[PDB]
Amino acid sequence: ARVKRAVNAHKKRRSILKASRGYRGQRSRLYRKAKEQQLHSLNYAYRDRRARKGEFRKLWIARINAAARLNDITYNRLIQGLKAAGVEVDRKNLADIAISDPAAFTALVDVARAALPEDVNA
Amino acid sequence: KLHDLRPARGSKIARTRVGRGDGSKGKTAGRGTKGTRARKQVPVTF
């Protein structure tokens, strides 16, 4: 019973290549070189989605800091004040507010300033 | 009939094909070494 092992292998070849399309040079043409890249690419996606989440926090923080400085207040005391106020609002939508409605951001700043106690002593 | 004829459950254990990738059993497959055992069987006596 000779089986002619071409077909079964071709399923892998055409699948991996059609997914690997777009890669430069001997990456989107060669099965055995493409296969390497899918391994590296997918390990990269695996860690990059998580890093992406952290990255977006970094961006949101920077923008909040910018608007906060426009209202003459730091990010530190901003978050401290909002926590004291119980305003459990995430940094994503807070940074959104910074653009959609800067006045609302100013209002939240006044709330934080009022909620903050007096100084840096305890 | 034959189309309703079935083997007993628990019998007919599939043959563990050995040298067919890492997910099946392995590249070295049992003989995970480089010494005598990797290449030939030492007499049980020795």
Binding site: A1 | K1, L2, L5
Partner: protein, 159 residues
């Protein structure tokens, strides 16, 4: 069958020495990996038969036939002849008028006058003597037909 190293003609020469050639360590011209090479772990011409207990054989057979009796698939006919000569046409009318099924097993015995001649040329119809009543034919065929002598012989041999 197949062909392993040693049956392949030649191959005793060891060309492409191990220094100054830049080629792999060939060592023989008919190794498996070479075009026209031998077959490793090939299908050697096995001659085998899964010997089983006679009690398993008999139990399985009487089990299958007993299920046919439970479903009314046993047609213990008396004979099939126009006197002495065969008549396949009449066999068709008889079998397809009482059974009305595709695959049929016929048990007659050692009578070649109108035994395995009238039932021949009937797709799905197989015929055998009581002594050779296997199970594969029984499970393949539905309306198992017996002669009176088939029942007497089978029962007598099987108490």
């Amino acid at each position: 069958s197949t062909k392993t190293r040693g049956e392949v003609s030649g191959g005793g020469r060891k060309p492409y020495r191990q220094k100054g050639t830049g080629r792999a360590r060939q060592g023989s011209t008919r190794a498996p990996q070479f075009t026209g090479g031998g077959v490793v772990h090939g299908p050697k011409p096995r001659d085998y038969s899964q010997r089983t207990p006679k009690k398993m054989i008999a139990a399985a057979l009487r089990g299958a036939l007993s299920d046919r009796a439970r479903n009314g698939r046993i047609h213990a006919i008396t004979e099939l002849v126009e006197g002495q000569n065969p008549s396949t046409k009449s066999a068709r009318a008889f079998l397809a008028s009482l059974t009305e099924r595709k695959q049929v097993l016929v048990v007659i015995g050692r009578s070649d006058e109108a035994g395995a001649k009238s039932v021949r040329n009937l797709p799905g119809v197989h015929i055998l003597a009581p002594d050779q009543l296997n199970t594969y034919d029984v499970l393949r065929a539905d309306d198992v037909v017996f002669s009176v002598e088939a029942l007497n012989a089978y029962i007598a041999a099987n108490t």
